[PDB]
Design a protein around this motif. Structure first.
Motif, PDB file in Angstrom:
ATOM      1  N   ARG A  52       0.820  -1.208   0.000  1.00 48.59           N
ATOM      2  CA  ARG A  52       0.000   0.000   0.000  1.00 48.59           C
ATOM      3  C   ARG A  52       0.858   1.264   0.000  1.00 48.59           C
ATOM      4  N   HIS A  59       1.384   6.561  -6.922  1.00 51.45           N
ATOM      5  CA  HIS A  59       0.302   7.493  -7.221  1.00 51.45           C
ATOM      6  C   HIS A  59       0.781   8.935  -7.120  1.00 51.45           C
TER       7      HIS A  59
ATOM      8  N   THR B  11      -2.928  12.687   4.567  1.00 49.48           N
ATOM      9  CA  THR B  11      -1.779  11.835   4.278  1.00 49.48           C
ATOM     10  C   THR B  11      -1.252  11.169   5.544  1.00 49.48           C
ATOM     11  N   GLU B  12      -1.271  11.886   6.671  1.00 45.20           N
ATOM     12  CA  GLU B  12      -0.834  11.289   7.928  1.00 45.20           C
ATOM     13  C   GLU B  12      -1.761  10.161   8.361  1.00 45.20           C
ATOM     14  N   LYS B  14      -3.856   8.323   6.144  1.00 43.13           N
ATOM     15  CA  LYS B  14      -4.387   7.643   4.965  1.00 43.13           C
ATOM     16  C   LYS B  14      -4.761   6.200   5.283  1.00 43.13           C
ATOM     17  N   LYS B  15      -3.881   5.484   5.986  1.00 42.03           N
ATOM     18  CA  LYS B  15      -4.160   4.089   6.310  1.00 42.03           C
ATOM     19  C   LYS B  15      -5.341   3.966   7.265  1.00 42.03           C
ATOM     20  N   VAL B  18      -8.587   4.813   5.394  1.00 44.55           N
ATOM     21  CA  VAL B  18      -8.985   3.733   4.492  1.00 44.55           C
ATOM     22  C   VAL B  18      -9.517   2.542   5.281  1.00 44.55           C
ATOM     23  N   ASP B  19      -8.871   2.204   6.400  1.00 46.53           N
ATOM     24  CA  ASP B  19      -9.329   1.082   7.215  1.00 46.53           C
ATOM     25  C   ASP B  19     -10.727   1.337   7.764  1.00 46.53           C
ATOM     26  N   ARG B  50      -6.361  -1.475  -1.564  1.00 43.61           N
ATOM     27  CA  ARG B  50      -5.494  -0.699  -2.449  1.00 43.61           C
ATOM     28  C   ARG B  50      -6.306   0.188  -3.390  1.00 43.61           C
ATOM     29  N   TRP B  54      -6.212   4.230  -3.510  1.00 38.35           N
ATOM     30  CA  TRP B  54      -5.961   5.015  -4.715  1.00 38.35           C
ATOM     31  C   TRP B  54      -6.991   6.125  -4.871  1.00 38.35           C
ATOM     32  N   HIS B  57      -6.261   8.865  -2.385  1.00 32.14           N
ATOM     33  CA  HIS B  57      -5.076   9.621  -2.781  1.00 32.14           C
ATOM     34  C   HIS B  57      -5.387  10.582  -3.918  1.00 32.14           C
TER      35      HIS B  57
END
Ligand SMILES: [Cl-]
Ligand SMILES: [Cl-]
Lengths: 134, 128
Positions: A52, A59, B11-12, B14-15, B18-19, B50, B54, B57
């Motif tokens: 990821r 990206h 961005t800090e 993002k994971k 998304v989770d 993923r 995307w 992002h």
């Protein structure tokens, strides 16, 4: 805001998953210590997080190429670099090697003018990664 | 000016964003993680994560730039390539991504950020 850059961004967007897969397998063939016990890609959850993160970097490179500006790398790119170094415990030469494999897997789909137009973005992310402890 | 801070926040996290969005979506649509669903197996879940990443992002980059051109540019390209994965699941996934992202903002930040999620959802609804 460019014909050729739009075409390259289209190519990198259609093949993002394949590029990331090939780049990660290349990196783990070249650096067997990453998937060894203690490595950053040993376990399955660590491997998924690595995929990821590599995807995020691909990206960002594709977006900077589509835009024609490298500002976003110095902006949010450094945040992701710091997060990958700290939270995932990824040493700086492993981040550089991962981005290099991503670069080669991406340029393997372009020609020569496209590859020369694209490579500076991967190179800039590598440079931003190597001057981290400074 | 503010958009750089909002992009930094997305961005800090993002994971985590998304989770939370994926878990919310899979609670909302249990058929997605059921046998036959796009998130049933473990590899299916990783690929879905993923894809959602995307999309997040792309939204974050369009917010950082202040332009929504890339959505009409490469966003539709990725939608067409990924479909040829059903399209109507992508809509609610983007909705969950938006909710998880706006949970971290205030009021001016959320009002500035939501139009990008709204534009990608609208562009994704005109697909045939
Ligand atoms: Cl060093
Ligand atoms: Cl190189």
């Amino acid at each position: 805001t460019s014909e050729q850059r739009v075409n390259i961004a289209t190519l990198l967007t259609e093949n993002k998953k394949k590029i990331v897969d090939k780049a990660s397998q290349d990196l783990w063939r070249r650096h067997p210590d990453l998937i060894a016990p203690g490595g950053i890609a040993f376990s399955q959850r660590d491997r998924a997080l690595c995929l990821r993160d590599y995807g995020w970097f691909l990206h960002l490179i594709t977006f900077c190429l589509l835009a024609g500006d490298k500002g976003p790398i110095e902006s949010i790119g450094l945040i992701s670099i710091r997060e990958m170094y700290n939270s995932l415990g990824v040493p700086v030469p492993a981040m550089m090697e991962s981005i290099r494999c991503l670069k080669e897997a991406s340029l393997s789909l372009l020609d020569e003018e496209d590859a020369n137009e694209t490579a500076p973005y991967f190179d800039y992310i590598i440079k931003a990664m190597s001057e981290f402890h400074h």
